[PDB]
Amino acid sequence: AVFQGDFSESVPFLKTPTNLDGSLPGDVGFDPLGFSEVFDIRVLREAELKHGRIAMLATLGYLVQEAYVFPFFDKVPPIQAHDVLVKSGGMSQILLWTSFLEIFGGIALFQTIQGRRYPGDFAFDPLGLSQGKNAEKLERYQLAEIKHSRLAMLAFSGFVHQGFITKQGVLEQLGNFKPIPGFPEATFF
């Protein structure tokens, strides 16, 4: 805001979102269309983390699935694997167990709505990372988790879409990089 004004850190032009405060981790203040105003921030935070935690595993997997396949499973481009496993019924097994865990999760969301638990804490810290000795680290880690999650969700999105246009696997695209098919060759007119 070249003219002086009170304003949000991430975007100079817009005012700091109301009810958006530094307290949730990773708050650069960017909620340009308030969603936080329409729905509670804690319910939204639970979503950012859940999507992210799902995404972070997915980014690793799409890359790992390209390089390696468990021997019992066939090696196919990952998007194809979902079709193979869905016929196999492997995906139903992932769906059933993930749903069971989610039902416990849905109860915890209801508690998050009624005070009680902080968004996204399932108290899953089997290892001692951020243990009471390491309790200082939790604030820092929280920031990393949102940041890794925000990035992963963008990255997976990218890997899958880029892969559809290129028809080229992400590791392969890196090492051999080509324009979307036909562009060097094609003339629009």
Ligand X SMILES: CC1=C(C#C/C(C)=C/C=C/C(C)=C/C=C/C=C(C)/C=C/C=C(\C)C#CC2=C(C)C[C@@H](O)CC2(C)C)C(C)(C)C[C@H](O)C1
Binding stretches for ligand KC2 (CB under 6 A): 183-184
Q: Is 88 in the site for ligand CLA (CB under 6 A)?
A: yes
Residues numbered 91 to 110 that lie near ligand CLA (CB under 6 A) are 93-94, 97-98
- The first and second tokens of residue 155, run together, are 């990255």
d(CA 149, CA 141) in angstroms, rounded, equals: 12
Kindly list the distances between the CA atom of residue 31 and the CA atoms of 45, 107, 141, in Å, as whole numbers in the listed order.
12, 27, 22
Tell me, rounded to whole angstroms, the distance of Cα 171 from its chain centroid: 20
* 172 CA to centre of own chain: 23
What is the token pair recorded at 148? 């890794």
Rounded distance between C-alpha atoms, residue 111 and residue 52, angstroms: 21
The CB-of-1 to ligand X minimum distance in angstroms stands at 20
**SS3 state of residue 182:** coil
Taking a C-beta distance cutoff of 8 angstroms, is the pair 45, 24 a contact?
Answer: yes
**Residue 90 binds which of other proteins, ligand X, ligand CLA, none (CB < 5-8 A, kind-dependent):** ligand CLA
Shortest gap between Cβ of 159 and other proteins (angstroms)? Answer: 18
CB of 98 to ligand CLA, least distance (A): 6
Nearest alpha-carbon partner for 80 in 62, 58, 97: 62
- Say which entry of ligand X, ligand CLA, other proteins, none residue 54 contacts (CB below 5 to 8 A, set by partner kind): none
Shortest Å, Cβ 132 to other proteins: 31
Return residues touching other proteins (CB under 8 A): 1-7, 11-15, 18-19, 32-34, 36-44, 86, 89, 91-92, 95, 99, 106, 109-110, 113, 183-184, 186-189
Return residues touching ligand X (CB under 6 A): 26, 28, 147, 150-151, 154, 165
Return residues touching ligand CLA (CB under 6 A): 85, 88-90, 93-94, 97-98, 179-180, 183
